[PDB]
């Protein structure tokens, strides 16, 4: 099973304040949604409560409490280790799309980043992690809108 | 200036039957609305008759004819000058169809955006061969009604 990493990261490194994502960039959620279409996500239950289970994806969401949801396409875990043990018998791929501590988790284990630069500097408390030493890009696109955002992929190996 | 190219490519080959793409692969047309976002836009003329000004993108569409009074589109007279005028406002201009305009800027683009739909269709407009200097360095499948898988080749 394959992991990849998508996330939208500001200039200082924010990901986060709060609940919130402290910018909105017209376009770049088109990124967002074209990579994830159809496809699982692995996100920590903070995030999924902000994103809602939107149409067209899959949500393998993990918590620590009891948390529940009687979505036919979410599936809820204790851990991170549970999601993946399960995952890998269902698909082939899924997509690690935040938020913070679950990024923290797992960056040193996907295969393929989409990271989406945000030309600002917000304030917030949530940081992306730092990315180890043997990813490196292989495309990237410069987009202008109201905040500019340039988007790059990053290769494992 | 750097140019990239975005098509989507039935499995037999086929991009279109006339004026029409002869498929409909939901969740595909999510990546050509994302990449494309307020890009400039190379398009030859039956195409942009096809897709039309679409909002949130610019158009440089060639004709040997053809007019728009669309402040979003620019219409010239050869690819050539439409190229040496992108330049002046642009570093990246992106390659959008049909097959008279990927024939002929093919060997001139950079990277490469191609989604391969699963369906053999009927059609008579086709994509030339990729040149053999690109490398793929980015795939990623979907399933949906119609599967279809998404990959960028770059220059080398
Ligand atoms: N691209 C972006 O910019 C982007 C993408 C996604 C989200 N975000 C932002 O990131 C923030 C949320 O990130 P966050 O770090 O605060 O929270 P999070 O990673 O979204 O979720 C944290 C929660 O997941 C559960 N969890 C975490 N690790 C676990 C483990 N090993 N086992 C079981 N459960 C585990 C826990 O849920 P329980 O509390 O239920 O136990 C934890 O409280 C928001 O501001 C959000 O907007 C930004
Ligand atoms: N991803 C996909 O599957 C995809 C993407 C886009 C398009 N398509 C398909 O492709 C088809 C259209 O392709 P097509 O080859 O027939 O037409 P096209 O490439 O869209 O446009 C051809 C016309 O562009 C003008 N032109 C071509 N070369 C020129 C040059 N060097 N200088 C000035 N003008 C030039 C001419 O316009 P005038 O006749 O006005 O002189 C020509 O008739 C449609 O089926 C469309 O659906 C498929
Ligand atoms: C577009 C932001 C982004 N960009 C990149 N590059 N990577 C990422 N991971 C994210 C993200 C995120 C979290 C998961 C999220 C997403 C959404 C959401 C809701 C609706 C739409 C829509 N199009 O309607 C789009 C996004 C809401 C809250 C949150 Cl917390
Ligand atoms: C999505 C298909 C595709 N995929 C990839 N990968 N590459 C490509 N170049 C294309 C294309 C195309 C031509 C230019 C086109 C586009 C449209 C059109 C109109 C509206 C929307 C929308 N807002 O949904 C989307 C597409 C109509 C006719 C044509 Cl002839
Ligand atoms: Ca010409």
Redesign the interface.
């Known amino acids: 099973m394959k992991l990849?990493l998508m996330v939208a990261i500001s200039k200082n490194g924010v990901i986060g304040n709060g609940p919130d994502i402290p910018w909105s960039a017209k376009?770049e959620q088109?990124?967002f949604?074209?990579?994830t279409?159809?496809?699982w996500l692995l996100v920590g239950r903070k995030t999924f409560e902000s994103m809602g289970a939107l149409p067209?994806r899959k949500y393998a969401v993990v918590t620590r409490s009891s948390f529940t949801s009687d979505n036919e396409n979410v599936l809820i875990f204790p851990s991170i280790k549970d999601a993946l043990t399960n995952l890998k018998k269902i698909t082939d791929?899924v997509i690690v799309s935040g938020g913070g501590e679950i990024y923290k988790s797992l960056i040193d284990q996907v295969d393929?980043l989409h990271i989406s630069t945000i030309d600002i500097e917000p304030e917030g408390d949530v940081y992306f992690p730092e990315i180890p030493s043997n990813f490196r890009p292989?495309?990237t696109?410069?987009?202008?809108?109201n905040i500019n955002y340039s988007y790059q992929?990053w290769?494992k190996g």
């Open positions: 990849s376009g088109l990124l949604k074209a990579i279409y159809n496809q067209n791929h393929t292989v495309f696109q410069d987009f202008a809108s992929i290769q």
